Amino acid sequence: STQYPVVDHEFDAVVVGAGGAGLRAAFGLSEAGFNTACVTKLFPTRSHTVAAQGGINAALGNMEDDNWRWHFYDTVKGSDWLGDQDAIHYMTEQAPAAVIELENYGMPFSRTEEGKIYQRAFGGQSLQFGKGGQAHRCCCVADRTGHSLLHTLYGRSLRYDTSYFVEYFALDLLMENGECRGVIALCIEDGTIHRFRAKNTVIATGGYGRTYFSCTSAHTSTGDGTAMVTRAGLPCQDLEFVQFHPTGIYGAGCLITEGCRGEGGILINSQGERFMERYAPVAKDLASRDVVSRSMTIEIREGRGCGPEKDHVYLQLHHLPPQQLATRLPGISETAMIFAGVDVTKEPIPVLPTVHYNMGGIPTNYKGQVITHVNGEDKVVPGLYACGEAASASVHGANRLGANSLLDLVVFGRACALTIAETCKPGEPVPSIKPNAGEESVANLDKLRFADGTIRTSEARLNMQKTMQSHAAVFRTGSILQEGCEKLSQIYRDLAHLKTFDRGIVWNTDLVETLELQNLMLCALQTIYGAEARKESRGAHAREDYKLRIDEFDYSKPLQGQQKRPFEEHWRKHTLSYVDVKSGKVTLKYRPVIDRTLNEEDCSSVPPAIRSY
Amino acid sequence: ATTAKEEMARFWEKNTKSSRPLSPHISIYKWSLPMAMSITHRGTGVALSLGVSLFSLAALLLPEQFPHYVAVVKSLSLSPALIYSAKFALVFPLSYHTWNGIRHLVWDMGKGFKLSQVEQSGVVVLILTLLSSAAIASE
Amino acid sequence: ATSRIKKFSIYRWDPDKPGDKPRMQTYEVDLNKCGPMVLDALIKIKNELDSTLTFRRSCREGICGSCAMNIAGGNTLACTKKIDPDLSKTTKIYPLPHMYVVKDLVPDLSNFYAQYKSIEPYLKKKDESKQGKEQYLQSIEDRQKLDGLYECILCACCSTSCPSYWWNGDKYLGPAVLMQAYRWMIDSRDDYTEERLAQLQDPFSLYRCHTIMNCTRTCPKGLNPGKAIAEIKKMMATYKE
Amino acid sequence: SSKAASLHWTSERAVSALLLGLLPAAYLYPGPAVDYSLAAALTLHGHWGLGQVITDYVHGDTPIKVANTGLYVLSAITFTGLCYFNYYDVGICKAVAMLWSI
Numbered sequence A: 001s002t003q004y005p006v007v008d009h010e011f012d013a014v015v016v017g018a019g020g021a022g023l024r025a026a027f028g029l030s031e032a033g034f035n036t037a038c039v040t041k042l043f044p045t046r047s048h049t050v051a052a053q054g055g056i057n058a059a060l061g062n063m064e065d066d067n068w069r070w071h072f073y074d075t076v077k078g079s080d081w082l083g084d085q086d087a088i089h090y091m092t093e094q095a096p097a098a099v100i101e102l103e104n105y106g107m108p109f110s111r112t113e114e115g116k117i118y119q120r121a122f123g124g125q126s127l128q129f130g131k132g133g134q135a136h137r138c139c140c141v142a143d144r145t146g147h148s149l150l151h152t153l154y155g156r157s158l159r160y161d162t163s164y165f166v167e168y169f170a171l172d173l174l175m176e177n178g179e180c181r182g183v184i185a186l187c188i189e190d191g192t193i194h195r196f197r198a199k200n201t202v203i204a205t206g207g208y209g210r211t212y213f214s215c216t217s218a219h220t221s222t223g224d225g226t227a228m229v230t231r232a233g234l235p236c237q238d239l240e241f242v243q244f245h246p247t248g249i250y251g252a253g254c255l256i257t258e259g260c261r262g263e264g265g266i267l268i269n270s271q272g273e274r275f276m277e278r279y280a281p282v283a284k285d286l287a288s289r290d291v292v293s294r295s296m297t298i299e300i301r302e303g304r305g306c307g308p309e310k311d312h313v314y315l316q317l318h319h320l321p322p323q324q325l326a327t328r329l330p331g332i333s334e335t336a337m338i339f340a341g342v343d344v345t346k347e348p349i350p351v352l353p354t355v356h357y358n359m360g361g362i363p364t365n366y367k368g369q370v371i372t373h374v375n376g377e378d379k380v381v382p383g384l385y386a387c388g389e390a391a392s393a394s395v396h397g398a399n400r401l402g403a404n405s406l407l408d409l410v411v412f413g414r415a416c417a418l419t420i421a422e423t424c425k426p427g428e429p430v431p432s433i434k435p436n437a438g439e440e441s442v443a444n445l446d447k448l449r450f451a452d453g454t455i456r457t458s459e460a461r462l463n464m465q466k467t468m469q470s471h472a473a474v475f476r477t478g479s480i481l482q483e484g485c486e487k488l489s490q491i492y493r494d495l496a497h498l499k500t501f502d503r504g505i506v507w508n509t510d511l512v513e514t515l516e517l518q519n520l521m522l523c524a525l526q527t528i529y530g531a532e533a534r535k536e537s538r539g540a541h542a543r544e545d546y547k548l549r550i551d552e553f554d555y556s557k558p559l560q561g562q563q564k565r566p567f568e569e570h571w572r573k574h575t576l577s578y579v580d581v582k583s584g585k586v587t588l589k590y591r592p593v594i595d596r597t598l599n600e601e602d603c604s605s606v607p608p609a610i611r612s613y
Numbered sequence B: 001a002t003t004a005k006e007e008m009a010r011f012w013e014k015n016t017k018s019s020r021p022l023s024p025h026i027s028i029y030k031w032s033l034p035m036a037m038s039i040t041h042r043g044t045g046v047a048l049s050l051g052v053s054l055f056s057l058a059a060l061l062l063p064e065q066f067p068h069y070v071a072v073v074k075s076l077s078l079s080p081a082l083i084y085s086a087k088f089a090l091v092f093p094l095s096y097h098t099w100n101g102i103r104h105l106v107w108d109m110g111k112g113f114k115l116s117q118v119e120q121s122g123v124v125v126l127i128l129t130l131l132s133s134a135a136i137a138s139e
Numbered sequence C: 001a002t003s004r005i006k007k008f009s010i011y012r013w014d015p016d017k018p019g020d021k022p023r024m025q026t027y028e029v030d031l032n033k034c035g036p037m038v039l040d041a042l043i044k045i046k047n048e049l050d051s052t053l054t055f056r057r058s059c060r061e062g063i064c065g066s067c068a069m070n071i072a073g074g075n076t077l078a079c080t081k082k083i084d085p086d087l088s089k090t091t092k093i094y095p096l097p098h099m100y101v102v103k104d105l106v107p108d109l110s111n112f113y114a115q116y117k118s119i120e121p122y123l124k125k126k127d128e129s130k131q132g133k134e135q136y137l138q139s140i141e142d143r144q145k146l147d148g149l150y151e152c153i154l155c156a157c158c159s160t161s162c163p164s165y166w167w168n169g170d171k172y173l174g175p176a177v178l179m180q181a182y183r184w185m186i187d188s189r190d191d192y193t194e195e196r197l198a199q200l201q202d203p204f205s206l207y208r209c210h211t212i213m214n215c216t217r218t219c220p221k222g223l224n225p226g227k228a229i230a231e232i233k234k235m236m237a238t239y240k241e
Numbered sequence D: 001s002s003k004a005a006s007l008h009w010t011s012e013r014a015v016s017a018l019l020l021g022l023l024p025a026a027y028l029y030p031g032p033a034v035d036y037s038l039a040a041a042l043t044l045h046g047h048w049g050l051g052q053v054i055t056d057y058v059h060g061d062t063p064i065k066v067a068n069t070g071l072y073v074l075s076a077i078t079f080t081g082l083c084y085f086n087y088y089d090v091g092i093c094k095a096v097a098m099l100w101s102i
């Protein structure tokens, strides 16, 4: 050797990540009596959650009569029927309660004339199960809702005995006989190693938009938690479903909230058309993201792109009252200027679809427990939980509704807190771990620390980011997807020629970024190989060489006298990816989509049907 | 988990015994008019103070009363210029500190805090000082 | 072619280099093949010339507050600070001022963090037996009082720019924290005003502020910590019980 | 009282205002009354003023204690000298008119 010192920690439970999901599960546990430990690689308030703008959905009814079941409906239709409706049941029925909790904590929600929480319009959201017109259930704090939401949560956590370990990098899970014994990590401040023996581990580490070259995500969204599970021999789910947000400013890729269109802002091309009226006669600009992005994409490569390169489009806001802009969208107004010199009251905002959110993630049940799939049956992995963007419950399926992640965060983060609280008891004897538990992680660490090859970290990463960006975008195809696989597989191989320079251990971000590359690559492989395998069009996954959505039945005609297709012959099912770490070979399997709700009498399960906005 | 006080006490405990350097400050920080006028308010205050203290002492210790030292000065037919100057260097600190001193009492009412107002007042203070000095040193 | 080379002098130091001493290192960057922000420049250098150049960063859009540092004399967010087009000037870059340096441009903000904690930056109602049932009522009017106070991102630029902080940083809260102490004093939903003021009854926490105003000038989100501190003082002198 | 700190602050500014209102007085009504009023207001403002400076720059229990004590003497002797000057000599106001007559 041990050329590194190891300190073993003993806790009832361990939380990994301090964004929305993380903080809420962490103090939820301590709030329940357990001796919790929160491990994060960033100071809590620096998490990508703090960058969120638009809002968090809840059927409060502060703007009009609402029904949480209509909210449910929206999300199921939204997920092109790939979302587990039981998960979607819980998420949408707990929402009002989740939001009110936030306001009761301190969240400075913008107010109505009645002294209540202000809600705006957002994409793919209606009343009366898709018949009663546009809805207004996106609770918010101007256009800085993520900022406030995280700042409040961190503030709330300062009230319990939760032990935090900030700027600690998590390496892998402490696995023993199919169960999780904790996690191992590197203390970046003083370069030491740490193993946390706990009866329960919760992972909420974010997504991995940084697998691509153009994303809205932060440089710290490197899917670290996703890779840890993989190295455990556990499957990740639906990683091929990548959401491209419609409005990410040109050049910097920074995000421009959907809230803009929700206040009146529209889309316009070179000639000046509001093309969305053409593609989506009703929803127009408030159609689903997956739908909208393809629309933009088309207008461009088709010839009507804007700018000096005819490569982007225009988001117009200036036709709206200056007061409303300064009151609803003050954030983006300050961003436009600093990154495009645009003044939202005088000129349009240059934008184009940008990698933004990951629908796929570590598979769990509606209780936040991590599951595995063996011989056609899901089975919970004792001691492991997941929530946040790093998880796949999966409330979002093949297309996430705007303002549903921030909701998911708080709802499931608490759920992990509740499930554990009802399952285990604080104080229960912590599991033993073999003396050498984790030496291989250290091993890898040391190897990357003194790496001296031909291809430096910054170069490999840039090769990965450019292949995803070319072989797995809004529109995808078999040949192009096939090449991207070859290209990536080669790069993953070339990682053996990696070269690093910093030979220190304290705040060696040269090293850390190399640990993250291994992480991003794993995520990327499963993404592109899963994409190549899925020959159908569903949500954010459009194959021009397979333009139809293949379900077990053809729901374009009456079901009477129809032959239900075999599991093996249709694609209405989650993807299950596995990776041969040492070689980097992808292995896929598939599991069924959960369509039953938590209670049929209370919330009707919703069957497939044509998906149009 | 540790308390805020437990963290502060341990913060100094670890860093005061490390080999970590202290990032520079005064030597590398950019100045501004407000910032400079701020230090100057303090300097003139201290000087004004010592001045008044140096006066009470001389009163308790010197041999002659004040009237005699005033004569000892007049029987020196000093260049009125040197006279003027001496009067200017006499009332400049007092002048500055007072106007700027007023500026502070206004701030204490929470008015004039916009950064562009801090500059404006700073400059009005600088012209009132000069004008109210030249005048006195000439009377 | 037509490059455009620019020199950056940046502060260095390695805790793992035995007996190493702070020093400046210069780097030349072609502005033609780089982003317009100093952060963009700092990342280019690390990826292509000295991957040992250590520093904090995340969001790259000036909202997480990670890239705080002293760029050309003034504290700011490297991710939203424009690189100077003037090639005749070498831009120096330091860590936040008067801070214990962990490595290169990474300061130790753990006292800053605890200071924040100590003002209890969370809603406290006298009757907390109803937390979770219904929305608390707050009018448009009272909500407006929070504008310019909640936007803070705790970057520590203001506090590390204030001379009083430099001198009594161990007992003086500093602009950041104080403006958040005010953020909860004027929140129409908080019932602990007097207690939050009671806590500032000492020679240091609040009174080390002599209105220098380095804070307001330096804030990246355009906040006015200095004026918030001014209003506290008025409350300190006008409350009772 | 518990509210000591905020009371000191208020008094300071009041005294500041007081001293500012004496300036107009010493030039329009020079005499005993103003003369002594200045000695008092000048000593107090100066006293509280130099203390804030000691507070910012002096650290360590001893130094602190020393600085404050040394300052307490400086003040008391100053108020004393001024009063002496006001009783045994012409007085502050008159001395200025005389200095300025040179």
Ligand SMILES: *Cc1cc2c(cc1C)nc1c(=O)[nH]c(=O)nc-1n2C[C@H](O)[C@H](O)[C@H](O)COP(=O)(O)OP(=O)(O)OC[C@H]1O[C@@H](n2cnc3c(N)ncnc32)[C@H](O)[C@@H]1O
Residues within 6 Å of the ligand: A016, A017, A018, A019, A020, A021, A022, A039, A040, A041, A042, A043, A044, A047, A048, A049, A050, A051, A052, A053, A054, A055, A056, A145, A146, A168, A169, A170, A171, A204, A205, A206, A207, A216, A217, A218, A221, A224, A225, A255, A356, A357, A387, A388, A389, A390, A402, A403, A404, A405, A406, A407, A409
């Ligand atoms: C990028 C983005 C996303 C976004 C948005 C605007 C932008 C610019 N606006 C949204 C909105 O208005 N409404 C909504 O519902 N969603 C919106 N999103 C998406 C959403 O914000 C994200 O999906 C969500 O923030 C996910 O957050 P989560 O709680 O899952 O975490 P995180 O914020 O990403 O933070 C990750 C945490 O994990 C820790 N971590 C990561 N790796 C490690 C390792 N290796 N070791 C230890 N800890 C680790 C981080 O420190 C962090 O706390």
Ligand SMILES: CCCCCCO[C@@H]1O[C@H](CO)[C@@H](O)[C@H](O)[C@H]1O
Residues within 6 Å of the ligand: B031, B032, B033, B034, B036, B119
């Ligand atoms: C050390 C004394 C010299 C500094 C005095 C003026 O300094 C100048 O003040 C102006 C006004 O705020 C700023 O805009 C300039 O950048 C600054 O250099």
Ligand code: SF4
Residues within 6 Å of the ligand: C151, C152, C153, C154, C155, C156, C157, C158, C159, C175, C176, C179, C218, C219, C220, C221, C223, C225
């Ligand atoms: S008040 Fe301003 S400078 Fe101070 S920490 Fe907040 S945003 Fe950063």
Ligand code: F3S
Residues within 6 Å of the ligand: C161, C162, C163, C164, C165, C174, C175, C208, C209, C210, C211, C212, C213, C214, C215, C216, C226, C229
């Ligand atoms: S610079 Fe400092 S002294 Fe007061 S006004 Fe700002 S906190």
Ligand code: FES
Residues within 6 Å of the ligand: C057, C058, C059, C060, C061, C062, C063, C064, C065, C066, C067, C068, C077, C078, C079, C080
């Ligand atoms: S990286 Fe987030 S503030 Fe700059």
Ligand SMILES: [K+]
Residues within 6 Å of the ligand: A358, A359, A360, A361, A388, A389, A390, A391, A392
């Ligand atoms: K996900």
Ligand SMILES: [K+]
Residues within 6 Å of the ligand: C184, C185, C186, C187, C188, C189, C190, C191, C192, C193
């Ligand atoms: K209040």
